[model samples]
Target: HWGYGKHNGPEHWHKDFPIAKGERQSPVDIDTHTAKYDPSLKPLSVSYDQATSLRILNNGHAFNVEFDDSQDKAVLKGGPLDGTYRLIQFHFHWGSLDGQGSEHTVDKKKYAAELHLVHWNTKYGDFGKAVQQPDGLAVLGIFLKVGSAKPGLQKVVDVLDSIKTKGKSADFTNFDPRGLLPESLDYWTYPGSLTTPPLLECVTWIVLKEPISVSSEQVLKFRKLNFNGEGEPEELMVDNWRPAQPLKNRQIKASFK
Candidate 1:
């Protein structure tokens, strides 16, 4: 029941989910100059089959695109990963305005929004079992900047109106998730956790350095989404990103210098 609101915001989440204050929480600020460069880090190899894309749903927080991850049809490898991670679903986090929504920041700069593509390690069999282990998941983070309209994202943006309320979903298929990525695979990697409740510290965060562009018009569509469903008083689903957590003792690894 945790939500991004005055009564149940990130500050209040610790009251119910103790892991919110865990040692390895997510959405950290990446200090690029300080992040150690690792030449050994291989280029990320991402292979997502369009056929594996399943549906799009409004999970009360954001619109998520779920995939048929029952098999390893779509997976992410290399780039600080030990093995293949199966693509499960992808979601976004945005603010009401253009300048303050992204979860992860670089050099103290916050982008217009952020996108999280969630994947679980196949070594653990399934997402449920994988989420319990330290190396269970790998979330690819892509920052969204406010500039030109992203043609690749129009397909997703067009469907947002249909799933404006919580629990609303539609049959979505044949959409390639790769179209959303930036030109560069250069990134920073660190061990982190889920941004939401049950903030499990089981993710190897792969945050891309370069950001993709989205028009102001497209960014505004996300603000129309509601956190409440049906009869409840409408709460705009914006600023859903968790604040950056403490870095602790973990060293960040970068793919490029």
Candidate 2:
């Protein structure tokens, strides 16, 4: 099984999944000064229905809140995208230690954590079919910094106790993901691949510039999640993030000047 371990880590993924070495790899360092401001970029238009949120579970890699994407009940548009992308799920990446977990870094500095809200193009019928196309997915990345307690995020944190082991899941509902975002919608846009294996080069990344705050206590709760299933030796679910990949020659576009 693939994971963020010494043997199965990103460095060795290329052996099993050749596309791991693909040019448009994700979680690249975002150098703000070098990023070009794109006037053509539009403000992100997001509409999420709390009722669509189905459940939260530990997929052994990360804990994700899955959504019902059958229809346009909740969707994302604008912001360097061709069509509306329906929300499928949202998960997080973090480290066991403070200040070391986020996948994407700014100016070589890592954050306490990062959030990925995954979406797929509606034009492609479904996420399964769209994921194979170049313009298939649009993943919004939100950085998390350690600060005062985040009341709005407590809703997600509260469920950690129930899903402490791998494959564990609990019913989740009436939660609007928008409440977790920062005040600014300003972001950096790029073409990149999924950070995980079968690392397909189909995601249009829209990373928010402003990071939201999460208390240290809340972050520790995330570390309690185990990567192994019941009866297996416990493996802390921290540092489950992928390191930054080479940017090559791709342009990083900024929504704001």
Candidate 3:
């Protein structure tokens, strides 16, 4: 299993998914000192609208709100991407402690949580086929800071009680994904893979420079979710994050000064 625990965690995942040891692995340590500013990088454009959401679920690993990605009703473009990418789903990667949780850390600094906005290349036809390509996916990594309460995040957090166990899903529609974002779309762009297993090297990671706020109590609610389901051994769902991988030959580009 793709466990995030000590023994079976990230270090041993490559035994099953060889790509886990691949050069372009994700969640690399971002040393801004070496990250160069690219003026040519255009401002990222997000055109997300409400009513596209389908449901929210706790899938043993993390909680997510999937969308109706049949069409490009919610789209992402302009930032280090050649064409339009369709918004598909979004999820969180958190931890047991407030000191650290996020998959991608900056200058060796960690955040309390991270949110991933997944989008697939429109030219690839569909998400299934898109995953098979090298440049087939785009992920917006928004860091969640532990500060003032976040209104947008509260909308999703409110539904966590309904999805207390794995496979348990609830109707979480009408909420727009846009509200989860920070004021600035300014970001750091790089080439990387999925933080979790099957560890495909197909994502263009655009991590935001700013972080949206979340509360200590809000994070506690997430910890209550279980990896167990229906009479299975009760286990808390915390520290569901992957450590940063090596940044072998990749060059991280910054969109702002």
Candidate 4:
């Protein structure tokens, strides 16, 4: 019911989730002029256990790689975070075409796609519980541009066929999420909510400045996914991203000067 369409898309989100219009909403447009350099921001670091990857699921929104977060096998630390946050899952948001996809933008420029590596604060227990507390989640947002193929990302594209329809999933293990990271850790961070529904304002967004390059062919593979359920009339899952939200009273802090 909360699909990305004229009827249920972001514009209609506030009707069901009042917080969609709340302060500190996510995927806000970023401008360098406004995003001040903060020498205090630390370099983002991640240690992912390949074995922690369990399966890939097409939740009718986007196919995601779920992790086995029993302990801290896969975790994210540093860079606007305290202690450690366990890596939970990673997912993509793409456009039907080349011009648009990324949720957060710089100077109003959109990327071909965006990747979110979700992690939750360990002190709060699991993701479900952490999601409810402020300062409980940290999401690394990376923009994707079309240039050359990325072995890391392409490996993921190879599996899209297995979970092409909603409710479908496939075994996916020994996957290194670090493959999705760009060469640079420089980023723009701010306080914001989850870009999707429930719209929880519990995320510390770390949006990287250097976008990773992937082949155009690989980017289109995401479109093959279905927004509808297994037996429903098939509809492509394109443009699965929320538009830029109001920055409100938040300030974008840059990790690089």
Candidate 5:
């Protein structure tokens, strides 16, 4: 229900999320009946180092992880899922309300929320510089659905009580994010643009097929987040997700067996 402004509801996100104007937007209703696969494309595994060692920030909207390339945690190998990239950051996109989270639609259906694990090519030196490159980035998309139990996601929520205010963040010291990943890494791969504006077209997307279920309570805690500055103490910035866009000429791929 909440978005950038008027005519910006989930049903019409392409209008507000600045990046929607790009030609590579995803979650497009693909007529699978007419689809074909290219054996050249596949899904890659993210190195344990990069997935574990990270710098977490509560950047007003959601929790984002900034990683160190030199650290043992961020490594990149090659595969259908592998590209020469390093895990640099990861964040989440959720709905303003519990009933409507997630930015991508699967065969015309919407899920609860979506998590983005952002990576950058080593060619750009690091994420700080890579953000400027058109083809220097890759992102993993994980969809989150609301369910009955706390999927341990609340461990992240526990910190919100301390970093509850917007524009505020804590060290999140020595925490491993591996605990948050879904059980399977199987994904749908594609050449696409950044879901947000300045929507760079160089990104390669790995959308996991598995959906993680976070407890409604965890969702409630996430809803506690806000971005209205220190003045709006009660305004929750819980829903920070963008919506899916047209597929255009792009075709999504899956990892080779």
Candidate 6:
């Protein structure tokens, strides 16, 4: 019952998705662009090992990893990035168990899950305060697809065995949230809004076009996450993704497209 019921799922999200209208919405179809649009995607110079403390929370929707601001820092010095932003939280979005779950679809195709790396502008104090400002939030949307077995995801996938039973949570105290990033940060940036409730039309959405591979076993593991509360995990948490919305006549621009 992973919330995809007749009245409680995707159809219901619109009740709050409107706030995100025109607010730099992401997952736009922008497969065409010039090299000038080529944006330099860089990794944070800070060593993921010692840069910050990570706190994980099983926020009904996905695992939310909050990073300590003072340490884990990234400077977006060139390309589409204007300045550095601090990594704030890491979470996910998916579909009914295994079909398609990515947020941004390309050429009408959808992936398995969409992983988000939330960052905030240092100018706004911190992630909590910055989340409210239109210019304060920047999210990197990474799509996941089933692939060769990779041990890296175990840090997250292994938790499925437990989270599926926890229902709602916020208990993680220590962890390295960076274990989820793909090998490359080269991405496509566009203005967008929060994909969820209130759908705040304030966010810089940098969606990486590349699809990372998570094992089929991992995908099966994700199915354990559902909305049944107890009973029998029916609605597997497979493809919980949204279809690509119309650009509404707006120019679907991109970075290093």
lDDT at position 25, candidate 5: 64
Question: What stretches of model 1 exceed 4 Å from their correct place?
Answer: none
* Per-residue accuracy of model 1 over 172-203 as CA lDDT, tens digit each: 89888988999999999999999999899999
lDDT of 2 at 125: 95
TM-score of every candidate:
0.98, 0.98, 0.98, 0.98, 0.82, 0.79
Clashes of 6: 19
Q: Residue 170 in candidate 2 has what lDDT?
A: 99
Cand. 4 TM to true fold: 0.98
Error of 5 at 12 (Å): 11
Off by over 4 Å in 2: 49-51
What lDDT tens digits, residue by residue, belong to model 6 across residues 56-128?
6544555566677774454333434556667766777776645577787766577777888777777877767
lDDT of 3 at 38: 99
Q: What tens digits encode model 3's per-residue C-alpha lDDT throughout 1-257?
A: 77777777888999999998889999988899999999999999898963299999888889889998988799999989999999888999988898888999999999999999999999999998988888999999999878788877788888988999889999988978888889999999999998888899999999999999998888888888888785788888888889999999999999999
Task: Indicate the residue-level lDDT of 23 in model 2.
Answer: 89
The window of 10 residues in a row where model 6 has the poorest summed lDDT is: 38-47
TM-score-superior candidate, 3 or 5:
3
Compose the digit string of candidate 2's lDDT tens values, residues 178-201: 888899999999999998878999
TM-score for candidate 5:
0.82
Angstrom error of the Cα, residue 233, model 5: value is: 5.8
